[PDB]
Design a protein around this ligand. Sequence first.
Ligand SMILES: OC[C@H]1O[C@H](O)[C@H](O)[C@@H](O[C@@H]2O[C@H]3CO[C@@H]([C@@H]2O)[C@@H]3O[C@@H]2O[C@H](CO)[C@H](O)[C@H](O[C@@H]3O[C@H]4CO[C@@H]([C@@H]3O)[C@@H]4O)[C@H]2O)[C@H]1O
Ligand code: CA
Length: 268
Amino acid sequence: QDWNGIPVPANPGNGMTWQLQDNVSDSFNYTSSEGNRPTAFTSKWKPSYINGWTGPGSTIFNAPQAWTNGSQLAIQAQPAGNGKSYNGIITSKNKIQYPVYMEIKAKIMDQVLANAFWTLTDDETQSIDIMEGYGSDRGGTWFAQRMHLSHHTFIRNPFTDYQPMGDATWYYNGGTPWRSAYHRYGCYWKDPFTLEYYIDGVKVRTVTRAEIDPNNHLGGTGLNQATNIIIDCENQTDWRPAATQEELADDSKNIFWVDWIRVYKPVA
Ligand SMILES: OC[C@H]1O[C@H](O)[C@H](O)[C@@H](O[C@@H]2O[C@H]3CO[C@@H]([C@@H]2O)[C@@H]3O[C@@H]2O[C@H](CO)[C@H](O)[C@H](O[C@@H]3O[C@H]4CO[C@@H]([C@@H]3O)[C@@H]4O)[C@H]2O)[C@H]1O
Ligand SMILES: [Ca+2]
């Protein structure tokens, strides 16, 4: 695999080591697209959201915009007309649950669109955002230069959304924009109350119990459910400027590239 010899940066415990979870890991070293979906892909992933929802704001999730090129997954955006985009997404066919380390090597788009690697339960109440980036300087240099590290707890009806909002939820890298290179974005979901984030193999943030669910949307369980993996892009016009149609058409800038995803659990 692509990550051969790259250590897992999280601590598996004394007298423990890390073990790869095959069914949610992929080096994406195959070619695939709409009408050419091989087993290497369909055994693990589907190019759609976890249900029929087509995305927030000006997003239109669309299967053709997820594909692979022999070495990387492309999560692509396209013009949809009427101020909207078509947006790539994949989701896992298999669930994961703490304790679990999950990491991608990826390069976000030079777009105002969100690009994210995240989890979401079938009931849509629990989410971890391993990363959520906004690449273009047209969205503000402040955003282009920061990576969002967060999680959500929801009540579905009426819709109520909690995430931590402390300054440490947006991680700065000296002014280098995140669009400029591939980085490794990782998170150890250690238990329902403990999340650690890792960028380029370095621990950059720890979230503990008080920040997990202070409004009690989950009734005291914390982030405890088996959940789905998602990698997507979104046109989040409820709070972001809309992408222009020409930006969405520019294929030198409209692809969120993921070289690989790897997932491990701690073992003796
Ligand atoms: O950028 C990546 C993500 O980052 C953060 O994680 C965000 O929290 C996440 O947005 C969320 O994704 C899901 C979970 O909660 C919201 C949210 O936008 C989303 O789910 C939809 O929420 C809307 C309400 O705003 C609806 O409740 C919708 O329900 C659907 O209703 C019908 C159609 O399909 C089924 C769905 O449940 C139903 O039969 C939710 O899907 C990302 O931005
Ligand atoms: Ca690869």
